[PDB]
Amino acid sequence: LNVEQSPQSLHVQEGDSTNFTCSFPSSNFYALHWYRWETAKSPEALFVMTLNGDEKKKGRISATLNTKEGYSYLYIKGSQPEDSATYLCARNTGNQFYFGTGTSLTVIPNIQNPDPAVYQLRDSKSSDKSVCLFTDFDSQTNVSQSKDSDAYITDKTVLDMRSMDFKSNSAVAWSNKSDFACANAFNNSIIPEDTFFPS
Amino acid sequence: MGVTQTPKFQVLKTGQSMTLQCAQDMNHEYMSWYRQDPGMGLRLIHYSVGAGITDQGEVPNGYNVSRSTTEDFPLRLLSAAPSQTSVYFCASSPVTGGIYGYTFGSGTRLTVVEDLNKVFPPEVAVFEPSEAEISHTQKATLVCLATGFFPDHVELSWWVNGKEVHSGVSTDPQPLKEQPALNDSRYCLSSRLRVSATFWQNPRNHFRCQVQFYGLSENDEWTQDRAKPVTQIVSAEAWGRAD
Amino acid sequence: MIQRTPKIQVYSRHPAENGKSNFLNCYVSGFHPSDIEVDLLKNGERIEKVEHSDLSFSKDWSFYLLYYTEFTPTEKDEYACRVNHVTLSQPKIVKWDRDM
Amino acid sequence: NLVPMVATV
Amino acid sequence: GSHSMRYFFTSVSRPGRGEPRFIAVGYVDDTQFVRFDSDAASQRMEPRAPWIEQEGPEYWDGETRKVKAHSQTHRVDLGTLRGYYNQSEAGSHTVQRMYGCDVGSDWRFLRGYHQYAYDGKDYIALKEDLRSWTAADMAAQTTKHKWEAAHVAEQLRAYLEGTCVEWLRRYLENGKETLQRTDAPKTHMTHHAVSDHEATLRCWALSFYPAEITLTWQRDGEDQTQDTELVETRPAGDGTFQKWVAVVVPSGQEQRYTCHVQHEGLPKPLTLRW
Ligand SMILES: [Cl-]
């Protein structure tokens, strides 16, 4: 009936190692499931765990199962940006399976000699929205926004490919004024010291 | 694979009914519908253990289904309530009472609005690489920004000279409310295209992000002064420059 | 597709103590399929309410059932069973023999 | 206690 | 002695009528402790022995849920098998299932079984090792291949050794006063006039438990077993059983045959003369 999944959300560095968890009533256990769920796509069967003490493991990923004190860990060894996604957990009730809250995971890619810097970009209708841009945005904050009320922020960490190195964790902010003002649009955040302003 | 599921996106005027189509071609006995709403993840609606057999789930209220055949498991929404806004999935598995994992359908995004009045197409805009980013690390970055749309049904691509590029692009995973307070908010979507500083310096190039919006159909009543917010593409284009 | 014919036994529960208060049993087993109508009778009259146990089956997959009613025996009364089953052409009637 | 699941033939 | 918990499943299709009839019953050594019938007014798994009533809260939620799940499997099972044997929606057909485990006198897991028949005739069954299957035919062979890839026997081993036993033991502790109580065979003899030359002699055994028993006769220790009729054991209706053996005898020559009887109840293999 109840499939708890914890923690709900975690950001970890590239190359680090987490190991989230999913616990369930051990009463009437028969089988367990794990799913990789890439953001905005279909969930995808990862493991199918059944017997006690048995420890399935695929790629840099693994899993255990303790059917008596109802729990299962999902470990990730040397972790990668690609391994970012919401990980789900289901147990039977029919003939049925009941998914847990689901644990969303982000893996922030670290960088070839980081270039923390803030830039401003103008539109094509002269002076409007002049989007702000924060390259190599350090994620010590990354809660949601920053200095926001009549400002909009959609900073998110992405990846490839390769030529002069590329793993996209920038940030971006804009508004309805143009009187907005970059190099100032990221207040509620706690950016680094070497951050670079061109004016 | 696999489980084909139609349609992808959909807007509905409260009280309107609808059939969600999902079909498989693998002889999977078991088929089921889950919905998705933040905080509870996947909750089960109606499930089906074989042809002719249908059975209720965690949250069956307001939906019904049929299974006269092995392949299809249609989700009919009797009478749309605004609490029927959600993301739907159709999942199947080979053997009933078996342990196999569910191979999931594509998924469909459903928004149930009071008045179709609430539907807005987006406004795509492109933004020239920082003339100081090039002078710093020798890289150029184009930013595409779509704003003020509802509901959050869009696909954002780019186009160099006329080819759909995936190299170097980083879109947002999901549209964001302009201000999470609250439901008068439209949605937002951005993408960075980072290419060589000297490749955007080349004025011969035609950069273009496009955004397909999924909205109204010439079919729903349209009685407002503004354009009809149908399904349609919208593009902000640009050219390189060494000036 | 196997079809088997019932075996029928009509008996009391305890000893054959007359006038007293015993139980009348019709145990029918060894039959296929599971559909089977049973009746108990007091002098060829269909006994009102009868209990019967939960359908089960033995090692060869064959079916059995108990059919019982609380009754007061006389040195005069007449008890029997009226079984029907697709393997029968007519309902098998079995008189209840006390002093077997 | 029943087996939790019996798979189809 | 040993001890048992077995579950018996019977689902029968009904063309014109609606959903197929489903009866499941649970036993603990010759004692049914629960039942489910798809046509019962309750639509829940019910108690059949006063020692399972003393456990009436959330125990009946899972049992009811998993029994309704089993029924679901059997509903499909009827289509699959109909397709296999190329049958039609005309007549009625029958699947059966029976599983459970045995424990010894120590109560350490002794045996575990799981079998399945279609229309009376065996179809597929789980061997003693609980790792492999026996296919009655080529259709049952498809279920063996399917079931192998579904790893059904593995999930069976686990339950048959884990939960199946762990609970037998539980029930045994819960209802020690009747389940672990063995009654004695109160035996007697009779003698009937079949004509004017020949007699009978019927040897009885009543109000006993468990149902395992033995009876015969012998002329000079040399067992007769000719001209007899050893009827099947019959339930009394109160948890006790009955049985009898009969013989044909010349009304003169009789006292050369005895009557053997065996049973847990009392030690010495009781013998009877007329
Ligand atoms: Cl359960």
XYZ file of N, CA and C in Angstrom, chain A residues 1 8 30-33 35 37 39-45 47-48 50 88 95-102 112 115-117 119-124 128-133 135-136 145 149 151-156 158-161 164-168 170-172 174 176 196 198, chain B residues 5 30 34 36 39-42 44 47 49 56-58 87 89 96-107 125-133 136-137 139 141-143 145-147 166-180 188-190 192 194 237-238 241:
414
model
N 0.824 -1.253 0.000
C 0.000 0.000 0.000
C 0.840 1.276 0.000
N 14.086 12.638 -1.417
C 13.277 12.965 -2.581
C 14.148 13.463 -3.726
N 6.648 -10.090 -3.061
C 6.832 -11.111 -4.096
C 7.894 -10.699 -5.116
N 7.933 -9.407 -5.431
C 8.943 -8.858 -6.336
C 9.016 -7.343 -6.225
N 10.128 -6.789 -6.692
C 10.397 -5.360 -6.616
C 10.983 -4.873 -7.930
N 10.747 -3.601 -8.241
C 11.174 -3.021 -9.505
C 11.901 -1.701 -9.287
N 13.277 1.745 -11.730
C 13.118 2.376 -13.031
C 14.004 3.608 -13.198
N 14.069 7.086 -15.035
C 13.087 7.936 -15.669
C 13.700 9.277 -16.046
N 14.113 12.842 -17.383
C 13.179 13.963 -17.301
C 12.410 14.139 -18.613
N 11.083 14.212 -18.505
C 10.198 14.414 -19.662
C 10.182 13.256 -20.665
N 10.447 12.041 -20.187
C 10.366 10.842 -21.031
C 9.726 9.681 -20.267
N 9.563 8.539 -20.937
C 8.943 7.352 -20.341
C 9.881 6.667 -19.364
N 9.348 6.245 -18.202
C 10.119 5.441 -17.258
C 10.605 4.159 -17.931
N 11.709 3.604 -17.443
C 12.315 2.456 -18.102
C 12.861 1.440 -17.109
N 12.328 0.220 -17.168
C 12.713 -0.851 -16.245
C 14.218 -0.978 -16.092
N 15.957 -2.663 -12.738
C 16.134 -3.961 -12.092
C 14.805 -4.612 -11.765
N 14.846 -5.929 -11.586
C 13.710 -6.691 -11.063
C 14.210 -7.589 -9.923
N 13.791 -9.924 -6.465
C 12.798 -10.845 -5.930
C 13.217 -11.519 -4.627
N 12.459 5.448 -9.817
C 11.217 4.962 -9.220
C 11.360 3.548 -8.661
N -0.793 -9.320 -8.547
C -1.310 -8.757 -9.814
C -1.161 -7.255 -10.106
N -0.510 -6.519 -9.222
C -0.320 -5.095 -9.441
C 1.034 -4.651 -8.939
N 1.435 -3.446 -9.331
C 2.618 -2.818 -8.753
C 2.347 -1.383 -8.329
N 2.911 -1.002 -7.189
C 2.696 0.323 -6.636
C 3.991 1.095 -6.571
N 4.087 2.137 -7.386
C 5.280 2.971 -7.423
C 5.358 3.886 -6.203
N 6.581 4.201 -5.792
C 6.808 5.110 -4.680
C 6.874 6.540 -5.175
N 7.043 7.474 -4.242
C 7.121 8.889 -4.561
C 8.055 9.148 -5.733
N 9.124 8.355 -5.824
C 10.151 8.535 -6.851
C 11.227 9.475 -6.353
N 36.715 21.452 -16.993
C 38.076 21.834 -17.383
C 38.262 23.296 -16.995
N 35.313 28.566 -15.818
C 35.283 29.947 -16.293
C 34.065 30.706 -15.746
N 33.967 30.847 -14.413
C 32.803 31.541 -13.868
C 32.727 32.961 -14.400
N 31.653 33.279 -15.117
C 31.503 34.608 -15.710
C 30.054 34.934 -16.055
N 27.490 37.319 -18.460
C 27.395 38.090 -19.703
C 25.958 38.562 -19.966
N 25.813 39.527 -20.870
C 24.499 40.018 -21.284
C 24.341 39.890 -22.800
N 23.152 39.473 -23.239
C 22.879 39.195 -24.655
C 21.657 39.964 -25.147
N 21.833 40.774 -26.190
C 20.729 41.579 -26.712
C 19.964 40.884 -27.845
N 18.671 41.193 -27.938
C 17.736 40.515 -28.842
C 18.023 40.805 -30.317
N 16.953 41.063 -31.070
C 17.025 41.454 -32.476
C 16.110 42.658 -32.689
N 15.607 44.936 -25.725
C 14.481 44.304 -25.049
C 14.944 43.006 -24.403
N 14.375 42.692 -23.237
C 14.656 41.447 -22.506
C 16.140 41.141 -22.281
N 16.997 41.677 -23.151
C 18.448 41.491 -23.069
C 18.847 40.399 -22.079
N 18.570 39.155 -22.454
C 18.792 38.003 -21.588
C 20.153 38.025 -20.891
N 20.169 37.577 -19.641
C 21.400 37.481 -18.875
C 21.954 36.067 -19.022
N 23.270 35.906 -18.898
C 23.860 34.569 -18.991
C 25.044 34.357 -18.051
N 27.852 31.686 -17.309
C 28.593 30.474 -17.670
C 29.365 29.916 -16.481
N 29.456 28.588 -16.429
C 30.097 27.876 -15.325
C 29.505 28.294 -13.982
N 15.468 30.120 -8.113
C 15.762 31.404 -8.755
C 16.951 32.101 -8.074
N 11.485 38.848 -8.391
C 10.103 39.217 -8.112
C 9.460 39.445 -9.469
N 11.477 39.111 -12.094
C 12.576 38.512 -12.851
C 12.307 37.017 -13.039
N 12.804 36.450 -14.135
C 12.576 35.034 -14.433
C 13.898 34.304 -14.645
N 14.056 33.155 -13.990
C 15.311 32.396 -14.043
C 15.085 30.921 -14.382
N 15.826 30.424 -15.371
C 15.708 29.035 -15.817
C 17.071 28.362 -15.961
N 17.902 28.484 -14.926
C 19.220 27.847 -14.907
C 19.125 26.337 -14.710
N 19.790 25.584 -15.582
C 19.761 24.127 -15.509
C 20.994 23.500 -16.176
N 23.257 20.868 -18.226
C 23.194 19.915 -19.346
C 24.609 19.577 -19.861
N 24.734 18.953 -21.039
C 26.031 18.350 -21.437
C 26.636 18.635 -22.838
N 26.895 17.559 -23.587
C 27.858 17.520 -24.721
C 27.561 18.338 -26.006
N 28.382 18.171 -27.055
C 29.475 17.178 -27.089
C 30.866 17.733 -26.753
N 36.093 21.856 -27.884
C 36.830 22.680 -26.934
C 36.217 22.466 -25.546
N 35.802 21.224 -25.285
C 35.141 20.822 -24.033
C 33.752 21.447 -23.876
N 32.765 20.629 -23.522
C 31.406 21.138 -23.336
C 30.513 20.248 -22.467
N 30.152 20.777 -21.300
C 29.152 20.173 -20.424
C 28.350 21.321 -19.805
N 27.181 21.591 -20.384
C 26.431 22.838 -20.146
C 25.737 23.008 -18.787
N 25.188 26.289 -17.251
C 25.144 27.737 -17.187
C 23.931 28.168 -16.378
N 23.593 29.450 -16.473
C 22.386 29.993 -15.856
C 21.866 31.117 -16.732
N 20.582 31.434 -16.615
C 19.996 32.480 -17.453
C 18.807 33.170 -16.781
N 16.055 36.869 -17.063
C 15.510 37.966 -17.861
C 14.310 38.605 -17.162
N 10.873 41.969 -17.772
C 9.946 42.706 -18.635
C 10.351 44.163 -18.850
N 33.309 36.866 -13.435
C 33.877 37.836 -14.361
C 32.853 38.781 -14.987
N 32.188 42.060 -17.519
C 32.698 42.874 -18.625
C 32.141 44.302 -18.679
N 1.169 5.166 -27.841
C 0.205 5.874 -27.007
C -0.096 7.255 -27.606
N -1.095 -8.231 -19.460
C -1.323 -7.123 -18.545
C -1.153 -5.732 -19.172
N -1.564 4.626 -15.442
C -1.212 5.419 -14.273
C -1.291 6.880 -14.657
N 0.131 10.950 -13.418
C 1.275 11.563 -12.750
C 0.935 12.968 -12.247
N 4.441 14.990 -6.178
C 4.270 14.695 -4.764
C 3.815 13.271 -4.497
N 3.087 12.692 -5.456
C 2.597 11.313 -5.345
C 3.134 10.415 -6.466
N 3.870 11.007 -7.398
C 4.418 10.235 -8.503
C 3.332 9.491 -9.248
N 3.587 8.221 -9.528
C 2.668 7.426 -10.330
C 1.595 6.751 -9.484
N -2.043 4.502 -9.808
C -2.739 3.630 -10.757
C -4.221 3.967 -10.931
N -6.590 -1.098 -14.360
C -5.688 -2.083 -14.944
C -6.460 -3.188 -15.651
N -5.932 -7.385 -16.933
C -5.164 -8.623 -16.792
C -5.263 -9.542 -18.016
N -10.519 -2.124 -11.460
C -10.232 -0.784 -10.945
C -8.881 -0.657 -10.228
N -8.395 0.571 -10.098
C -7.087 0.796 -9.495
C -7.129 1.710 -8.290
N -6.006 2.350 -7.999
C -5.950 3.279 -6.888
C -6.936 4.427 -7.104
N -0.410 14.012 -16.250
C 0.376 13.307 -17.257
C 0.007 11.840 -17.184
N 0.244 7.699 -18.393
C 1.089 6.657 -18.954
C 0.303 5.358 -19.099
N 0.656 -11.865 -16.749
C -0.103 -11.546 -15.544
C 0.377 -12.428 -14.398
N 0.419 -11.869 -13.189
C 0.918 -12.600 -12.029
C 2.407 -12.916 -12.115
N 3.045 -12.468 -13.200
C 4.482 -12.633 -13.402
C 5.223 -11.453 -12.814
N 6.554 -11.495 -12.853
C 7.386 -10.473 -12.199
C 8.003 -9.458 -13.172
N 7.899 -9.732 -14.465
C 8.429 -8.836 -15.484
C 8.235 -7.342 -15.201
N 9.183 -6.533 -15.671
C 9.064 -5.077 -15.582
C 8.120 -4.535 -16.639
N 7.569 -3.356 -16.383
C 6.621 -2.733 -17.292
C 7.371 -1.953 -18.358
N 7.130 -2.270 -19.619
C 7.612 -1.418 -20.688
C 6.561 -0.319 -20.921
N 6.917 0.936 -20.653
C 5.947 2.039 -20.619
C 5.715 2.684 -21.966
N 4.490 3.160 -22.170
C 4.156 3.957 -23.340
C 4.839 5.313 -23.302
N 4.672 6.082 -24.374
C 5.317 7.390 -24.522
C 4.917 8.420 -23.451
N 3.637 8.438 -23.084
C 3.111 9.388 -22.107
C 2.385 10.536 -22.789
N 12.238 34.298 -29.238
C 13.253 35.318 -29.469
C 14.666 34.771 -29.295
N 15.569 35.215 -30.171
C 16.963 34.773 -30.178
C 17.871 35.891 -29.684
N 19.039 35.538 -29.156
C 19.909 36.519 -28.513
C 21.385 36.342 -28.894
N 21.967 37.389 -29.484
C 23.337 37.356 -30.015
C 24.429 37.109 -28.982
N 25.399 36.255 -29.335
C 26.523 35.933 -28.461
C 27.151 37.194 -27.893
N 27.543 37.134 -26.622
C 28.183 38.262 -25.948
C 29.493 38.637 -26.636
N 29.527 39.845 -27.196
C 30.699 40.336 -27.917
C 31.918 40.415 -26.992
N 31.762 39.924 -25.765
C 32.863 39.876 -24.802
C 33.151 38.442 -24.353
N 32.232 37.534 -24.667
C 32.440 36.109 -24.433
C 33.432 35.582 -25.473
N 36.945 36.478 -24.744
C 37.369 35.959 -23.438
C 37.848 34.505 -23.482
N 37.098 33.648 -24.167
C 37.432 32.228 -24.241
C 37.288 31.701 -25.664
N 34.488 31.533 -27.611
C 33.280 30.747 -27.856
C 32.049 31.640 -27.981
N 27.760 32.008 -28.007
C 26.562 31.392 -27.437
C 25.274 32.111 -27.837
N 24.397 31.382 -28.521
C 23.089 31.894 -28.896
C 22.028 31.384 -27.925
N 21.137 32.277 -27.507
C 20.088 31.919 -26.567
C 18.706 32.080 -27.189
N 14.632 31.963 -26.554
C 13.722 32.145 -25.438
C 12.273 32.222 -25.890
N 11.498 31.211 -25.507
C 10.062 31.195 -25.752
C 9.343 31.528 -24.453
N 8.361 32.423 -24.519
C 7.660 32.844 -23.312
C 6.151 32.993 -23.501
N 21.881 19.038 -33.143
C 21.768 18.585 -31.767
C 23.114 18.824 -31.094
N 24.129 19.064 -31.915
C 25.478 19.291 -31.425
C 25.601 20.635 -30.710
N 25.873 20.592 -29.409
C 26.116 21.813 -28.636
C 24.887 22.459 -28.013
N 23.712 21.927 -28.330
C 22.456 22.472 -27.822
C 22.138 21.987 -26.405
N 21.625 22.881 -25.565
C 21.112 22.471 -24.261
C 19.795 23.170 -23.925
N 18.684 22.543 -24.303
C 17.359 23.076 -23.997
C 17.020 22.862 -22.516
N 15.911 23.448 -22.072
C 15.367 23.134 -20.757
C 14.551 21.844 -20.868
N 14.548 21.031 -19.799
C 13.787 19.780 -19.786
C 12.272 20.008 -19.787
N 11.816 21.020 -19.059
C 10.384 21.256 -18.943
C 10.062 22.738 -18.768
N 8.951 23.179 -19.372
C 8.545 24.572 -19.303
C 8.326 25.027 -17.860
N 8.643 26.291 -17.590
C 8.550 26.826 -16.244
C 7.542 27.961 -16.160
N 6.775 27.984 -15.074
C 5.830 29.069 -14.848
C 6.580 30.400 -14.783
N 6.048 31.421 -15.441
C 6.690 32.724 -15.436
C 6.872 33.232 -14.003
N 5.837 33.057 -13.182
C 5.903 33.294 -11.740
C 5.000 32.267 -11.089
N 5.584 31.340 -10.314
C 4.831 30.304 -9.597
C 3.755 30.833 -8.628
N 7.532 29.237 -19.696
C 8.811 29.686 -20.257
C 9.744 28.552 -20.666
N 10.553 28.802 -21.685
C 11.423 27.770 -22.221
C 12.623 28.394 -22.924
N 13.820 27.922 -22.585
C 15.052 28.491 -23.127
C 16.032 27.432 -23.622
N 20.434 27.265 -24.856
C 21.721 27.835 -25.257
C 22.297 27.039 -26.433
N 25.827 26.906 -28.053
C 27.212 27.347 -27.999
C 28.013 26.741 -29.138
N 14.778 33.819 -35.887
C 15.953 33.494 -36.684
C 17.033 34.559 -36.520
N 18.258 34.225 -36.918
C 19.375 35.163 -36.841
C 20.486 34.803 -37.828
N 27.787 37.390 -37.788
C 28.277 38.739 -38.063
C 29.665 39.002 -37.476
